[PDB]
């Protein structure tokens, strides 16, 4: 467990601002509903494990020591998404948006396309 606060996420996701048409308040909203802002969120559900603040699965995007069938499109080890530096997470997230789009994150369409004003930080 290692969470950031809304305002910290707003500071650390600065590169994604505008990328793929998605604003910062959408990403701040999306990520709360995706991982609670916890950089070491790990969720195994059935056939895949999902890592970090962005919940990137070891199925298509990264290499996992316990799943050799991965496509590893991000060409990285999934554990590098469990640390405190979101620099590479952001790189992976740009490849996902290139290939799949922001709808990889279900909270976006469901809870974060409307009324983004509460997700603001002038702090
Ligand atoms: Ca990282």
UniProtKB/Swiss-Prot annotation:
Q: Which residues are glycosylated?
A: 46
Which PROSITE patterns does the protein's record reference? GLYCOSYL_HYDROL_F22_1 (PS00128), GLYCOSYL_HYDROL_F22_2 (PS51348)
MF terms in GO? calcium ion binding; identical protein binding; lactose synthase activity; lysozyme activity
Please state where this protein is localized: Secreted
Residues annotated as binding Ca(2+)? 80, 83, 85, 88-89
Please tell me where this protein is predominantly located.
Answer: secreted
Provide the disulphide bond pattern.
7-121, 29-112, 62-78, 74-92
* Highest taxon, organism lineage: Eukaryota
* Annotated ranges, domain C-type lysozyme: 2-123
Q: Name one GO cellular component term.
A: extracellular space
CDD domains xref list: LYZ_LA
Q: What does the entry give for GO biological process? A: defense response to Gram-negative bacterium; defense response to Gram-positive bacterium; lactose biosynthetic process; response to 11-deoxycorticosterone; response to dehydroepiandrosterone; response to estradiol; response to progesterone
Q: In which tissues is it expressed?
A: Mammary gland specific. Secreted in milk.
Keywords, sorted A to Z: Allergen, Calcium, Disulfide bond, Glycoprotein, Lactose biosynthesis, Metal-binding, Milk protein, Secreted, Signal
Q: Which InterPro entries match?
A: Glyco_hydro_22 (IPR001916), Glyco_hydro_22_CS (IPR019799), Lactalbumin (IPR000545), Lysozyme-like_dom_sf (IPR023346)
What is its quaternary makeup? Lactose synthase (LS) is a heterodimer of a catalytic component, beta1,4-galactosyltransferase (beta4Gal-T1) and a regulatory component, alpha-lactalbumin (LA).
What PANTHER family has UniProt attached to this entry? ALPHA-LACTALBUMIN (PTHR11407:SF32), LYSOZYME C (PTHR11407)
Family recorded in the similarity comment: Belongs to the glycosyl hydrolase 22 family.
The role this protein plays is: Regulatory subunit of lactose synthase, changes the substrate specificity of galactosyltransferase in the mammary gland making glucose a good acceptor substrate for this enzyme. This enables LS to synthesize lactose, the major carbohydrate component of milk. In other tissues, galactosyltransferase transfers galactose onto the N-acetylglucosamine of the oligosaccharide chains in glycoproteins.
Q: What is this protein called?
A: Alpha-lactalbumin
Organism lineage:
Eukaryota, Metazoa, Chordata, Craniata, Vertebrata
Q: Which gene encodes it?
A: LALBA
